[PDB]
């Protein structure tokens, strides 16, 4: 299947308490492999997956340098945004960045991303064509004009299609054993009466990778997708994920329901009946 590389960064300003807190993480698919935390001891980019540890000291130096540089420009970005919006210097603000690339099954470029949020909302994003920017407001319009004049997009696009893709192929190769695994969900059903007339049917999916999955309930053959409670996919901590979906059924009617599981790891979707 497709694969992805992502870097996420967050800077949170803390006026009166020093410089912004800065945290960056790197992912291949749903596997974290690197991190940097401004409040941690090393002040280095650090490994978080075994297959990245084999990279030499040049790698760690270059990556540390780039991530630190990014934290510094983030600091200035926070100041500038304060000017653009005329916001008080007493308020804490958040700057988020996502960057990365998607490749397909044989490793060919699929997509590239470079986008920013300010205080939880879209600020500026590289468009899918990798040739221009979407600015979500007027401040971001200022930034957008600057980046057009600076010709940032040519560099970013070339980086996305070249360096990012080659990096992703590299990582996928070195982390072969773990990253190219697909783990099908182990499913089951539980029954919890809530009264003399009402019961809860709960369909569970466990031990699966990658994290993307679909869990649906249907009565006879018709979806129940507004009567289904559906919790957020969660990490087990072992590299796999967990999810469940529940429906309330009339006592005696349990046998009418089916749970359906769609996952990349299954040759075919599952149908489960009580």
């Amino acid at each position: 299947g497709s694969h992805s590389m992502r870097y996420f960064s967050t800077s949170v300003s803390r006026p009166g308490r020093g410089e912004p807190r800065f945290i960056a993480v790197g992912y291949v698919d749903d596997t974290q492999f690197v991190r940097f935390d401004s409040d941690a001891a090393s002040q280095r980019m650090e490994p978080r997956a075994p297959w990245i540890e084999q990279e030499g000291p040049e790698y760690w130096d270059e990556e540390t340098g780039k991530v630190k540089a990014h934290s510094q420009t983030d600091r200035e970005n926070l100041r500038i945004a304060l000017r653009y919006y005329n916001q008080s210097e007493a308020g804490s603000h958040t700057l988020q960045m996502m960057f990365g690339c998607d490749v397909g099954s044989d490793g060919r470029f699929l997509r590239g991303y470079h986008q920013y949020a300010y205080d939880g909302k879209d600020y500026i994003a590289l468009k899918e064509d990798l040739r221009s920017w979407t600015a979500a407001d007027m401040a971001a319009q200022i930034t957008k004009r600057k980046w057009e004049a600076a010709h940032v997009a040519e560099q970013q696009r070339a980086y996305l299609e070249g360096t990012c893709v080659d990096g992703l192929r590299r990582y996928l190769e070195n982390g072969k054993e773990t990253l190219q695994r697909t783990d099908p969900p182990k499913t089951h059903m539980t029954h919890h009466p809530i009264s003399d007339h009402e019961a809860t049917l709960r369909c569970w999916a466990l031990g699966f990778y990658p994290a993307e999955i679909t869990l649906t309930w249907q009565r006879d053959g018709e979806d129940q997708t507004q009567d289904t409670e559906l919790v957020e996919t969660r990490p087990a901590g072992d590299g796999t994920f967990q999810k469940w979906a529940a429906v309330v059924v009339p006592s005696g009617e349990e046998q009418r329901y089916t749970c359906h599981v769609q996952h990349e790891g299954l040759p075919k979707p599952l149908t489960l009946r009580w």
Binding site: Y7, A24, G26, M45, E63, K66, V67, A69, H70, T73, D74, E76, N77, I80, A81, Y84, M97, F99, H114, I142, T143, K146, W147, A150, V152, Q155, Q156, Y159, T163, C164, G167
Partner: peptide, 8 residues
Amino acid sequence: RFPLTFGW
């Protein structure tokens, strides 16, 4: 590989 980044 971490990206290079530009000021706002």
